[PDB]
Amino acid sequence: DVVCDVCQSPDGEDGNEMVFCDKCNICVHQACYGILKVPEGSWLCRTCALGVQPKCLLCPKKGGAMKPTRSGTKWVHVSCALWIPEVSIGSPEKMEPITKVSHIPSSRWALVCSLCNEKFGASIQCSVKNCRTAFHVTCAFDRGLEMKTILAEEVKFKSYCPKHS
């Protein structure tokens, strides 16, 4: 039916409802996109409100829930910012801005996404400890890899290559 673009979940919660953008028809949880209060009527995402189609600094995928850095001139996928370790979210409840992008190591910038083979952006790797297979977060989602947020002794983000999914 309908799924949240960030976490790929179809179910809402009390105080964490599914909200739809009036223009691009995208769907996001309150907690996933930083919506503090359910709107009284229609609602717009950030890029539709600004009227721009920015490219993600970290992956080659176009469209989807994106948030801006402190500058407001650069944009990053919420999923990419969540799943890439070195990236941090300025506000954990407003879900913005996307910061510490400069902290991504050169070794991560050097990884080639095994799914699209586009030497652009930043890729994460398989959660299995010896699996060096790398891929974009958005590519991992679109291709259909196992992408879970599990609760350990603490939320841990697990992304598994096709072989280990």
Q: Footprint of Zn ion on this chain (CB under 5 A)?
A: 4, 6-7, 21, 23-24, 29, 32, 45, 48, 56, 58-59, 77, 80, 113, 115-116, 126, 128, 131, 136, 138-139, 161, 164
Task: Give CA separation, 1 vs 4, 8, 49, 77, 104, in Å.
Answer: 11, 12, 25, 23, 36
d(CA 97, CA 75): 9
C-alpha distances (whole Å) from 62 to each of 12, 55, 65, 130, 154 are: 25, 6, 10, 31, 31
Residue 134 has which token pair?
Answer: 């790398």
Nearer to Zn ion, 2 or 70 (CB): 2
* Smallest distance, Zn ion to C-beta of residue 153, A: 23
Residue number, 74 or 164, with CB nearest to Zn ion: 164
Bin 74: left if φ > 0, else alpha if -120 < ψ < 50, else beta: beta
**Least distance from C-beta 154 to Zn ion, angstroms?**
19
User: Considering the complex, what minimum distance in angstroms separates the CB of residue 158 from Zn ion?
Assistant: 11
Q: Which is nearer to Zn ion, 108 or 153 (CB)?
A: 108
Supply the minimum distance, in Å, between the C-beta of residue 118 and Zn ion: 6
- Under DSSP, is residue 137 helix (H, G, I), strand (E, B) or coil? helix
Of the pair 87, 153, the CB lying nearest Zn ion is at 87
